[PDB]
Design a protein around this ligand. Sequence first.
Ligand SMILES: Nc1ncnc2c1ncn2[C@@H]1O[C@H](COP(=O)(O)OP(=O)(O)O)[C@@H](O)[C@H]1O
Ligand SMILES: Nc1ncnc2c1ncn2[C@@H]1O[C@H](COP(=O)(O)OP(=O)(O)O)[C@@H](O)[C@H]1O
Ligand code: ALF
Ligand code: ALF
Ligand SMILES: [Mg+2]
Ligand SMILES: [Mg+2]
Ligand SMILES: [Mg+2]
Lengths: 466, 460
Amino acid sequence: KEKFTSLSPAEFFKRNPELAGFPNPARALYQTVRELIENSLDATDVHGILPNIKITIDLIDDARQIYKVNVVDNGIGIPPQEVPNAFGRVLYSSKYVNRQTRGMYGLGVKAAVLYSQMHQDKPIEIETSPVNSKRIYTFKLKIDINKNEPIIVERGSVENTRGFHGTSVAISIPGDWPKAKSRIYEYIKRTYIITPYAEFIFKDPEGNVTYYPRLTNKIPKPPQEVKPHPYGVDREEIKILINNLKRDYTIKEFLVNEFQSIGDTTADKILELAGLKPNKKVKNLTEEEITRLVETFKKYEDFRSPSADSLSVIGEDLIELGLKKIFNPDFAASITRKPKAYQGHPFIVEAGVAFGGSIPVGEEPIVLRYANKIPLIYDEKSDVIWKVVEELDWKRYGIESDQYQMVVMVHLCSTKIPYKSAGKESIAEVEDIEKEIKNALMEVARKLKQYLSEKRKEQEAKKKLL
Amino acid sequence: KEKFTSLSPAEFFKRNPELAGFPNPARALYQTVRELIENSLDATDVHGILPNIKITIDLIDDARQIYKVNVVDNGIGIPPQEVPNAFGRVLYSSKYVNRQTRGMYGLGVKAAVLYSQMHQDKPIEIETSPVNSKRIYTFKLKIDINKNEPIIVERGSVENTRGFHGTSVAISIPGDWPKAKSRIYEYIKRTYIITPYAEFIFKDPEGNVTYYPRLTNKIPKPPQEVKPHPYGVDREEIKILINNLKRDYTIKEFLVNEFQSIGDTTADKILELAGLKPNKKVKNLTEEEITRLVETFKKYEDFRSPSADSLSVIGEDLIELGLKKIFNPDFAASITRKPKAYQGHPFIVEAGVAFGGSIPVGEEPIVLRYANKIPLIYDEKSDVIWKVVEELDWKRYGIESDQYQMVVMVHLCSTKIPYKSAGKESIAEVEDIEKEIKNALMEVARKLKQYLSEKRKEQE
Ligand SMILES: Nc1ncnc2c1ncn2[C@@H]1O[C@H](COP(=O)(O)OP(=O)(O)O)[C@@H](O)[C@H]1O
Ligand SMILES: Nc1ncnc2c1ncn2[C@@H]1O[C@H](COP(=O)(O)OP(=O)(O)O)[C@@H](O)[C@H]1O
Ligand code: ALF
Ligand code: ALF
Ligand SMILES: [Mg+2]
Ligand SMILES: [Mg+2]
Ligand SMILES: [Mg+2]
């Protein structure tokens, strides 16, 4: 006999930790480190703070292979009333607002906590002080998995006599340092290369310390919350927008006020195409009217692009700088494309190419993938970026031979990155994004083609001297 | 200022449908089809019913590219009181018990419903008639994503005069038939090849109808609920086993009764290793004692394997038959390995190899992945199976040229397949599973080596 039951979100990820990027102790150790670093970065640069991040990993128990990961930052901290749910309630986040941040699910640190409880018995340790806080608040926490709620094992407070702000998080988990080492270092290095306004200190389980110095004191304009672009906004999103209204808007007012890229004239045209009365109260839209609006948004070809301003890009200068620093190529080029939209979300693709020099020889490019300023490391061959790179005919762009020295970099940034998994690491096959990654790659490949054509012309001239 | 909020499980998957295997209309059309087929199979062969499954896809709106997918089965149906939550509450399942079924998350059909709701306005339609039912119970449903609760648009019943028993589900979604066509047909074909006791009818949007007739009326022994194997059972799972006890067991009694592969002699050895009192009441285990138990389980080297009868395999004969039917090779061999355990879950790897004949020449093996009797189609290169196949040195097993005609098939079955995502198209990197996949592949590769050795000698 079939017996029907429900799960809490915590039970769901406890039963299936592989879904959150915790399938084995090597990947788990890596995942915990990056989840904490991403939280610390979102807590600093999103708020105009030059990040100073300290990461330590200690082997606590050799026989059991338990490691303690501690990440300390100079971020905005967390209000003490929010700490228990922030670290101990699955699907709880400050990043569900429409804004480019590394975090997005309200899952990552809880998944590390669940993994922690599944395999050892020490609670997670949080110390935090909000900006201008008179106290440093401390917590020891577990998750009641059935209830999906925090258990406060311990809480305290101490006088903040040094005016410190930020957060320390320490979590004890199974790990495999030897297997995870190269990917943890690659993660931090690739973060650092595109984040020169940050400083990192990293102490590993072998007691090695690496220092990654701040190279610039200029911080990018922090991304902020924005209204959706109408292209690809769906029926449920329309309902959300309507339900959130404090005013009794007409449909016309709703269009101009709740979206980017809609003025009076665009609103009039959308209303005409969708068969909607400008003056009807939007709270009264029917199910079928909502469909018509969503379809109209989808097929409308005259929308202005989203503002480049919901997003934070790496930028052509830095992309090129970083490719040169790491690979010492004969040639490098990059492009930061103009903003597009997919499913209501502004996005930008940036692309870079490096060729020759110290880049090793192979039969395929080295592909460097980033999403919202996070370097992607695992699962590359199923990423949509890899799909696009593989499908491009490099013979069209001057790559004559089967063996060559090329690096290709792609950064996607958006108010929402569509990952294939909650562990992130790879980007899903979304058609508008796929198309724009291709256009961007084609644009830099054209700069490569020019470089290779000039080299070829020189060679041809030299050939005549023979 | 940072504003902290919560999401319901419905809101989570509506915001991130890519996580459930709904990233674009082509994959979504495919995913909807397979989620429904897998639901129908779990409702039939798990209950000793020879599955009779009909799949129809109709293009209902050309301009908007909206398709209606209807799957009809002869399964056990759903109790009418359970239908609204079964189809309209995210994280609600009958497959949370420890048992080999295709389904596992309590999400799949709800994810299709969310995708349906995001893009069009017709509700999902369910008709169901459990065994002996004199009525067919009908529903139209939506999901209130904020509450994660069903919305009942219609609900009723008619007398069951034609003796329908089973379930019909129809759902309208955006799709891309031209792009999904080959993978949908591949999915049904590979399911049929390993499920000869099932009968399928497929009507596609172009009006093609394909019949896949039943070839045998002998169903495999249905998979049942089973006890965990102690190796890799975690601390939270120990707590659950303790909370579920209906008697005041000692730790010793706990070990013998609640786990596979622990007889009283093994229990004595574990209690000694873990430093636990045999006669202590298990409800009194401290946090630290649970840790020691779990570590002891992980390190104990003389556990017997779990019972093979826990799981439902394809079997060597059927694997080889299937390979021969698809590829017409010169050589085929297969192995159904003895059971292993990972994270407290029994699993079996089966592996097949085919060489030569009508297999095309290429630079790598054709790799056929299956998990809990489902053919995997997307994301092959990120799959742990692919990792093992790729990392194997085929030169050690007779493949000398860079070009060659080889098919490799791997089936993993378990009380739990660890997928990389809830879209269930690739298996995660779990080391016990990776190791056993390699071991199984090596075993069949040895048979290949033998074939290739004799073939090489004959060439002169
Ligand atoms: N180091 C930190 N500093 C400030 N806030 C943090 C920090 N770590 C976590 N948070 C807060 O806790 C919330 C939950 O964190 P997490 O589970 O990692 O989810 P996510 O980062 O995807 O939102 C975050 O949205 C953020 O508001
Ligand atoms: N065709 C059907 N026949 C019988 N039961 C079904 C059918 N479809 C769905 N169910 C039931 O509804 C539950 C929820 O289905 P689903 O969301 O697909 O989750 P899952 O299959 O992963 O458990 C299933 O666990 C099963 O009990
Ligand atoms: F912790 Al996250 F998306 F960054 F769940
Ligand atoms: F429908 Al499922 F796991 F099979 F959510
Ligand atoms: Mg996070
Ligand atoms: Mg299902
Ligand atoms: Mg199961």
